[PDB]
Design a protein around this nucleic acid. Structure first.
Ligand SMILES: [Mn+2]
Ligand SMILES: [Mn+2]
Ligand SMILES: [Mn+2]
Length: 430
DNA sequence: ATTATGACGCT
DNA sequence: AGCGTCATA
């Protein structure tokens, strides 16, 4: 009754850029705008690998992880932009810098948690309280929510899509009680007003469009964001959760897309998030562990407490390259040459980071994969990172891995290396 | 031969 | 610490 926690205390948004690397390339090159286009890395093997796809191209069935040659079979007029190559490898600097543009704008509205290169969570609870106090009990006009969907509406007693959005929004606003400054539905709505403003600012100041979700926690905000992409935002209320979750595959919820989610489905013999409500907390804990069980018990009721962390900057800076098939590194000087390439990019990014962000990395992590190993990483070793010097870092990385060489002869490297990875970690203020 | 990342959990 | 999981362009 009166003591049932309802996961309504916060207003949280997730803002995610639409087709982000494609938009970055379309801003730069107007010829790519409003076209089926994709961003590709490398070229020689099957046309290169697609890592981002415009919505026009998605209509032809083009997806991420498709080879461009294969994408061209679906979409012959597909336009392509290539990721920059520097020091023999893909270099993602243009996209990291475009990300900073967006993150800095969002940070003007609230403290953000950078969740990926193209998305961040926002805790809007305080901003909403302030806006409410300013509103002075004044109703919220539909004109303040021009790109907002209310999930689950319209419902009850027009065949155009914008038409439908407006009838849902109208039903929502008609029902609101703007008299109560503590009403969660009202708080979400004001949250959505602020996110319209945020998204307008991002588009005005960068040229990039994005989508967003507004809810009471991160998981619902993330889920909401995807419901009406691109260039729209979606409000998922607490009350919308039972219907939403009643047909929502478990794998769609963040963190359940992998083995845990598959185990929830197999062990419990269920398919949809809503079906979890029929298990006790202890039952879920018995199968999935204490933490996962409690998380699932609350999450299937729309409740989650994971805070929006105040962190706008990545806490690691890394450089990685695969050496697939017959390009695997089989000699010492090969291994050393590529460690240097990676280390030179790492030094460049580290030095920029120190100037921009007043911090220094103190640990270097070195990771390799060996031919035959299914695992992403075969071996990970750390050493001290005391100087931003590429030659020292690459020499140090070699030192930590030198014993992995199975060969009797030192000039040869075996079994051949199919991945190298350098990562700088453990930052301290400077 | 999707690749290049990046956060967080376990023991 | 080193490994595993899950995630996103
Ligand atoms: Mn995106
Ligand atoms: Mn994203
Ligand atoms: Mn994506």
């Amino acid at each position: 009754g009166p003591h049932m926690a309802t996961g309504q205390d916060r207003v949280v948004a997730l803002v995610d850029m639409d087709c982000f690397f494609v938009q970055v390339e379309q801003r730069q090159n107007p010829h790519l705008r409003n076209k089926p286009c994709a961003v590709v890395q490398y070229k020689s093997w099957k046309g290169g690998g697609i890592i981002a796809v415009s919505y026009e191209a998605r209509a032809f069935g083009v997806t991420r992880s498709m080879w461009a040659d294969d994408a061209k079979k679906l979409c012959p007029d597909l336009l392509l932009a290539q990721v920059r190559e520097s020091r023999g490898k893909a270099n993602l600097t243009k996209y990291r810098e475009a990300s900073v543009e967006v993150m800095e704008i969002m940070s003007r509205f609230a403290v953000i948690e950078r969740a990926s290169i193209d998305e961040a969570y926002v805790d809007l609870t305080s901003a909403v309280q302030e806006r409410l106090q300013k509103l002075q009990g004044q109703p919220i006009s539909a004109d303040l929510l021009p790109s907002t969907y209310i999930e689950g509406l319209p419902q009850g007693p027009t065949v155009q899509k914008e038409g439908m959005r407006k009838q849902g929004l109208f039903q929502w606003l008609d029902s609101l009680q703007i008299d109560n400054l503590t009403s969660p539905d009202l708080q979400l709505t004001v949250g959505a007003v602020i996110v319209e403003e945020m998204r307008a600012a991002i588009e005005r100041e960068t040229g990039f469009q994005c989508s967003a979700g507004i809810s009471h926690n991160k998981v619902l905000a993330k889920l909401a964001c995807g419901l009406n992409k691109p260039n729209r935002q979606t409000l998922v209320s607490h009350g919308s959760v039972p219907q939403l979750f009643s047909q929502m595959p478990i794998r769609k919820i963040r963190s359940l897309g992998g083995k845990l989610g598959a185990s929830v489905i197999e062990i419990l013999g269920i398919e949809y998030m809503g079906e979890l409500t029929q298990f006790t907390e202890s039952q879920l804990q018995s199968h999935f562990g204490e933490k996962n069980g409690s998380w699932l018990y609350a999450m299937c009721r729309g409740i989650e407490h994971d805070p929006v962390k105040p962190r706008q900057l990545p806490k690691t800076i890394g450089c990685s390259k695969n050496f697939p098939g017959k390009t695997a590194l089989a000699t010492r000087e090969q291994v050393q040459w590529w460690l240097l390439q990676l280390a030179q990019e790492l030094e460049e990014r580290l030095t920029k980071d120190r100037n921009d962000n007043d911090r220094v990395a103190t640990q270097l992590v070195v990771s390799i994969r060996v031919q035959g190993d299914k695992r992403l990483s075969s071996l990970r070793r750390c050493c001290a990172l005391t100087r931003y010097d590429a030659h020292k870092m690459s020499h140090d990385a070699f030192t930590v891995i030198k014993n992995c060489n199975t060969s009797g002869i030192q000039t040869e490297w075996s079994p051949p290396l199919t991945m190298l990875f350098l990562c700088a970690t453990k930052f301290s203020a400077s």
